[PDB]
Design a protein around this ligand. Structure first.
Ligand SMILES: CCCCCCCC(=O)SCCNC(=O)CCNC(=O)[C@H](O)C(C)(C)COP(=O)(O)OP(=O)(O)OC[C@H]1O[C@@H](n2cnc3c(N)ncnc32)[C@H](O)[C@@H]1OP(=O)(O)O
Ligand SMILES: CCCCCCCC(=O)SCCNC(=O)CCNC(=O)[C@H](O)C(C)(C)COP(=O)(O)OP(=O)(O)OC[C@H]1O[C@@H](n2cnc3c(N)ncnc32)[C@H](O)[C@@H]1OP(=O)(O)O
Ligand SMILES: CCCCCCCC(=O)SCCNC(=O)CCNC(=O)[C@H](O)C(C)(C)COP(=O)(O)OP(=O)(O)OC[C@H]1O[C@@H](n2cnc3c(N)ncnc32)[C@H](O)[C@@H]1OP(=O)(O)O
Ligand SMILES: CCCCCCCC(=O)SCCNC(=O)CCNC(=O)[C@H](O)C(C)(C)COP(=O)(O)OP(=O)(O)OC[C@H]1O[C@@H](n2cnc3c(N)ncnc32)[C@H](O)[C@@H]1OP(=O)(O)O
Lengths: 255, 257, 255, 254, 254, 254
């Protein structure tokens, strides 16, 4: 429906890419509860849209998201905490984060929840939760550490210091850096490529990669094998291999 | 043995390095079932050869291995796959295995290199997991070892698009530890295998087992296992000789015992 | 007490940083049992000193620590061993390692036990245990691998080869590289920053980041959440978020 | 309102939310519609401040004979690949009062509950194998973890059923009561849980569940963090003071 | 053919692969030669399309009294660090019919089996401690996971034996039968399993085993993936249809 | 020189270190001072070359009624973030002879022990919930792992107690003895253990403990490494030889 905090729209060839834009410039995209609710709606919608194969999440040019909404948490109590934030992780289709500008606190964690992260030349990542007398509460101490290593993760989480796009890429937090002006376009091109592939196979691949963080290498490889065997129960695997053998373009039907 | 797809031979000082070279150039070293069987044979042989301390696995200059053999699985069914189950044997080898990757190391080829303990890349090597382009996903640790070495963002990008990354990219990301000119790559990998072979076999096997454990348990339990293995080295003659040699300011004489 | 192998002292703004300096220059700071005992004492002392918020551990300019003391284990037997080295991991306050020069074997492991590692331009890391007929025995095969990746870790552990500061940073083993002359000063500045934040919250954050190596991503995020909720039971969380909302400097009380 | 389930509050001061599966015709076979209502009832009781614990039960002859086979009969692999365990998202304790058949999906639903009380004639089993499939809702995970590999393999591979007595001896269920008083007894247990601090009860339940998600070392660390957390509540202060002051504790779920 | 074991096809349609340890003089002490033949028999039965389940047993006096001490007596540490668990690579179900002694390596072998049936006079134990060593084939892992820490510690640290009734009560074994009919009963169970779809049975067995290799959360996710997989088979379709059409299922193992 | 505990060496050759909690007035409430002495006694017995196993017990009426409520009553959340399980750092086996009450911290202490023997009238429980808190020393972890989720949830959420018979049936304790002979019997078991090689016993105990810290696969690998290690000891050679030579083994703890 008519969204208050986000702007959605389909893009790329055949409009196969679902674009979600955080639109709360006043608050530098502070992830207030309302914005989160709309974001989850947009994600669910694009997830159920058969023409969409990949989603691109972005914010403004100055800020992807400055964090969660302090104003909204300010008066919460411990007990409140014990009486929605990671719905993006339940989405089966790939989600690419096009990070331009600030991606701090909850904003940084939201980007890390995405499968792939592309950063604009002037993006900035950080977990300033410590400066607010709290710690990251949406995977900031988990996903950051796993991607960047203990030393840098400890430095960022304990001081609240920010790192550049170049630092993030070097550390493995993000895989590409693009000029501010073309960042979103480039992320859409990548989303396109992914959308071109079979949707069912892409979902299986994404699930396999994610498993790398939930089990031992041994069990991860076993799960990957089971999923690999599964692709053989699909038409697109048959079509993909035949196309290869027949040296012709493959025609995937997401089935 | 009389191999059809691979070329083996001992190299390095005292012929301590076992060199296995994938040899199916017309198929750019596509890993067909027959080649896999010979590779495993060569590995087992070098493993049982007491003169060998480390193995170097390589392919051609244009390709380490362009991938599994699609033509061989193109007709398989789900039931075939399940009710039919050896791609991972190289992981059962106790001696270190170094992959000297020159050119293409894609799909199964990339996974094979990642199964190796160390990876050295030639200036023009290329890594990628194009399984997605074939309507399938990596099936030999491609989504596990790549991710663990390269991080989620790059791993997702590669696995989901099938895009390739350069040798420089792979090194920067931690997939490979060294990059050498195409012409000297294999020589350099042999030098490293030699250094490793110089050490005590038994101790080297324990160390390799310890490092591998870093991917199978919590840091806490990993450190405990490492401790047990560390204590174990004290039950060997080489440990004694090694420390004695250092204290006595003289060269160590290891006997792999 | 009056230490024989280490030099301690408080530094940074308001002497909030506890500096421990390994001082056995003749043995290139080889980690003998006596030095380890003093180091543990210094750590415990700084841990219990209310004025200290972070500790900086360093050695000489030529060597952080050349390794454990070989002569001391030279005559030990397997039964000796099976029937203290990592107490530094029991410290709740952050510990930063300012590595200048050699950080080999036990020295490298000690540095890796620290939360953050800063390296001087000429630092060198390596695990030469293999050259002595033994393997790293204080997390060298675990922390190195987890930070540097399997390929480089195997190369280092199996050959005993050393890597440069630049290599270590690129691989994620250390997060910063500074000139030899200012390295310790820079690490103290980082410790200062950490010490200005809430001690209790900092301890929780450090615990959260460390958990990234002890459980699946799913459970790690759950633990992080519980710790996040916990911060709400503190005065500093309330002051931190209030200060932000009221556009004013936060005054933490480590409570 | 509900077509497949019957809900109602019970116990002291109506602190117990009782959900009763009601599709006697199909022996409470868990069809998609019933699952949707069950989840609703659960969410409702979860949000009801008056409720401290939930009791889930079915009929006297069957808790739930299994998922609805006719509903999946024609599904294909792609349909599948493209919530039956929402009960696991509930923070308040859920007790399963199993009378009669608790097979397949029914057995898995009971195992998803925190506590299981079985009527004298209850029967547990995972017959999915007889249908050319395997348990798909934790049947091979929760059963094994509670009963051990030998018995779990026997049940899953043959589809054989085990008695209430077997289930109790194996640790699948913690109590066995006469068919007629089973539900009443489960409600008494839920009452007791409801009398304790909700916030503390939620933390304890989360701690016990963690025993299946991490190593003992990390589990103990998490438990410690939760233990420290209780000190941030009024109920913990009240509970310990009441003890020291030899008086009854008055919890406020805060 | 074989020196230490006796194999033969049993059960309806010869669907059961029976392997019998045959080293009576050494009370089936698991020497290296016997292990090699056992692995051969397993591989053979595994590749035999007519076999759906394997039953492993020994004599009436002893399933297997332990590894062969004589064989390791002279080994050194270095020797040790320079295929005991092959039975674990078999995809088809393996039932252990334990009669008499199942000690040390013998106990571990039985524990490696998916299901364990014990004769009235079976005896389990891990006496490795009495020999100056510890169980080296999962004795401290599988025993503990099945029996609990207290009893496992007692057995491993003292070398004490437990009865068939103790083993069953503790969950080590799921059934106890008279010595004379034990093997027959295990074959009947193997028959039942063999009757079901081989591919689905292999998936189920893999799912149950996963209960010991990952957190409940990941185990449930793996089980789900395998569950979806069954939908890519003809047997699942046949199984569910047969139920719906109230008729007998004809599985074709695919 | 102990105020809260009574120690003394018992059994053949004074091979068993017996520690008796002695604060009958407080039903052995584990106050901080008692914990400090307990740890001292443990460390002492651990360093005593003549001791091979420790037996921990309390009074006939109570092993330990819990941690000291009076001592934590005034603690704050912040205090909590400013050596309760040191018994777990002891390499030699520790047997808990539980007579009477073993509640809360007391129950957790018993569970930290390697083996638990219970007197006919022992009682186990985790009443932390009744005090507005949750078990904080492994009560939700070790209890669950030994007793299963259903019973563990029941105990932790209601604070209800279970009998010795219940505890044994659930696997929490491995033996039940009359109140009067319980400690004697536990000492006999400690004797047996102390009979074997101390170095090998330490390795075995470490192996069994690993069953709760890693996947079955890695646990088996660790066990293997420990198994190989035993071959680097004289006691293993002595043990195997003694068996081969049909003679009694003479262990020298190395
Ligand atoms: C499960 C539940 C979730 C838990 C997850 C983890 C916890 C967190 O995410 S906490 C968030 C951490 N983020 C922060 O501390 C960042 C706060 N913001 C900043 O530091 C600055 O805005 C910064 C550096 C990005 C840019 O500074 P600047 O260019 O001067 O812009 P600035 O004027 O501060 O911001 C503009 C407006 O956005 C608002 N805003 C910015 N960030 C936030 C935020 N995180 N919450 C609420 N409002 C915010 C500002 O208050 C201001 O509004 P106004 O002037 O009307 O009060
Ligand atoms: C349970 C606890 C677990 C144990 C943990 C794991 C095991 C380990 O840590 S073993 C450590 C491995 N490290 C080594 O072998 C490195 C030894 N050091 C070196 O090789 C060199 O000192 C190096 C390369 C750093 C610098 O070279 P260089 O500048 O020429 O110095 P160099 O002349 O070799 O040595 C100078 C002095 O330092 C001493 N020293 C340096 N490292 C050590 C050491 N590890 N042990 C003992 N003495 C040492 C030397 O003995 C020598 O003293 P002296 O002349 O009186 O005999
Ligand atoms: C993530 C997605 C979830 C995945 C989870 C795992 C998979 C599963 O749960 S599959 C379910 C396994 N369950 C079964 O195979 C049990 C099927 N039922 C039975 O065996 C018998 O009903 C039994 C033994 C319980 C009782 O027999 P009986 O007393 O004769 O009663 P019975 O006549 O069979 O049942 C009465 C009615 O209930 C129906 N019914 C019973 N169970 C089911 C069921 N599971 N699905 C659908 N309808 C069922 C019967 O079809 C019959 O209806 P009708 O005669 O109009 O067709
Ligand atoms: C890491 C930090 C550790 C965290 C671990 C987890 C948390 C816990 O352990 S909390 C402990 C939970 N235990 C309890 O709630 C049990 C409390 N006690 C009881 O319920 C009863 O004493 C019971 C049922 C055992 C016996 O009742 P009864 O026979 O009437 O004896 P009772 O009169 O109550 O006890 C005798 C004396 O011992 C004292 N006492 C008993 N238990 C405790 C205790 N846990 N703490 C302090 N004092 C205690 C009583 O206060 C009384 O002393 P006094 O009359 O002078 O004040």
């Amino acid at each position: 429906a008519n969204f208050q905090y986000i702007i959605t729209e389909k893009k790329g060839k055949n409009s196969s890419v679902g674009l979600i834009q955080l639109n709360r410039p006043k608050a530098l995209n502070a992830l207030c509860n309302g914005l989160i609710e709309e974001l989850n709606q947009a994600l669910e919608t694009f997830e159920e849209d058969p023409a969409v194969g990949a989603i691109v999440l972005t914010g403004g040019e100055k800020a992807f998201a400055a964090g969660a909404d302090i104003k909204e948490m300010q008066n919460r109590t411990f007990q409140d905490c014990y009486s929605h934030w990671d719905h993006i992780t339940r989405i089966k289709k790939p989600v690419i984060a096009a990070v331009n500008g600030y991606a701090l606190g909850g904003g940084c964690e939201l980007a890390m929840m995405c499968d792939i992260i592309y950063a604009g030349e002037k993006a900035q990542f950080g977990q300033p939760e410590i400066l607010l007398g709290t710690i990251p509460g949406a995977g900031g101490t988990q996903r950051l550490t796993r991607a960047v290593g203990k030393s840098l993760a400890m430095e960022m989480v304990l001081t609240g210091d920010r790192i550049s796009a170049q630092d993030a890429k070097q550390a493995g937090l993000v895989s590409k850096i693009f000029p501010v002006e073309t960042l979103v376009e480039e992320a859409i091109q990548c989303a396109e490529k992914i959308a071109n592939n079979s949707k069912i196979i892409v979902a299986m691949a994404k699930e396999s990669v994610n498993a790398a963080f939930e089990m031992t290498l041994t069990e991860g490889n076993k799960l990957e094998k089971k999923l690999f065997y599964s692709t053989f129960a699909t038409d697109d695997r048959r079509e993909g291999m035949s196309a290869f053998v027949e040296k012709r373009k493959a025609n995937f039907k997401d089935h």
